[PDB]
Amino acid sequence: FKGQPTPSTITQITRAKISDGKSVRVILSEGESTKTQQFYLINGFFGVAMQDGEKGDEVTLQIEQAEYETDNIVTSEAFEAGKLIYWDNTAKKFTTTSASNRLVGRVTDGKDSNNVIWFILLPQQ
Amino acid sequence: FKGQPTPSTITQITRAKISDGKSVRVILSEGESTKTQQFYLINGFFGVAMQDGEKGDEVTLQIEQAEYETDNIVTSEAFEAGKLIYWDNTAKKFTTTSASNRLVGRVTDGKDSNNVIWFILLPQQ
Amino acid sequence: PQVMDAKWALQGNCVFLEHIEGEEIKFGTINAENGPVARIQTYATGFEY
Amino acid sequence: TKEMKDFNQTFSVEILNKSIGESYNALLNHIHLSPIINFNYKASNKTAFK
Amino acid sequence: MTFSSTSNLKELLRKVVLDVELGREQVQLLYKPIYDSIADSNL
């Protein structure tokens, strides 16, 4: 530290891992807002927003690669078990269309009558 | 058992999982050296070297897919939160430019004043 | 001894960051700091009568 | 020197007294057995391998 | 987390000496059966 009482030599030793990485803190831009326990793509990270937030507010995305339950699908498409599921940022909905859409998971349980699906979040490559 | 009275058949109860896969053991080649808690790409695995290892030594790489802190970026480029971060094995430095570089993680904190970034290590693709 | 060995010690460098409900806590670090060296001289006088 | 006794902690007079005793015992073996080994034996006192 | 990082700092670690037999071997007085001892102090 500054103004030490004696000459000294500090030998900093490195430590690469800082956190387990199951979640990430992301700033919401001007056009972005979040609700608790709902999926969002903010700053290139896709995950479940754990808190409500508005522009300039900090929210945390759960990226655990666990099995998640969602209803924000495009209803017109069928989601069979195991189908790769993609996120359409323009519509803010899960789709199997892919094309330019981001890959975000893989369906574990298919689209029931209530349009609910279960999928496993992918590691965001 | 040697010299048992009667023949006996050994039925091996198969199992698949050998280890949790958080870290991998690798042997350094004749042009590879490692320092403790630094990022290296040795034998197709990219991770944090847990041992000071000279050529021919036995070194461990951490591939936990956790969050990591690294100062080994290329300083010309601008690393922002969410940008995919690649490993230039010729220069032995992280880089946002994909090119033919390996994909290694995603940045969580942008390039600060001291060129330190935080990223989440992506799987071994 | 004639020359006194340098002290050594470790520290913890944890910093308390604000924890939103789903944050991964970010771990600290340690550093080793070592002190200086010092030595002791011999002095003497005398008389003869 | 006085510095050797004071500053060299391992050094002490016990080590020197141990070496006086050891070399003294080795002297006793020498002065009493050297007349036997070192003698120029004549043919009458020599016996071959056989 | 990084004991390999602190391994080079030998002064932090405990110094435990490996006890091993050092020093010259003891000397015996072998001459005694071969000699007759007279120990008059006024020789």
UniProtKB/TrEMBL annotation, chains A, B:
Q: What is the lineage of its organism?
A: Bacteria, Bacillati, Bacillota, Clostridia, Peptostreptococcales
> Which Pfam families does this one have?
Phage_cement_2
**Source organism, top-level taxon:** Bacteria
Q: Specify the protein name.
A: Uncharacterized conserved protein
Provide the species name.
Clostridioides difficile (Peptoclostridium difficile)
From TrEMBL, chain C:
Query: What top-level branch of life does the organism fall under?
Result: Bacteria
Q: What is this protein called?
A: Uncharacterized protein
TrEMBL record, chain E:
What highest taxon heads this organism's lineage? Answer: Bacteria
- The protein's name is Uncharacterized protein
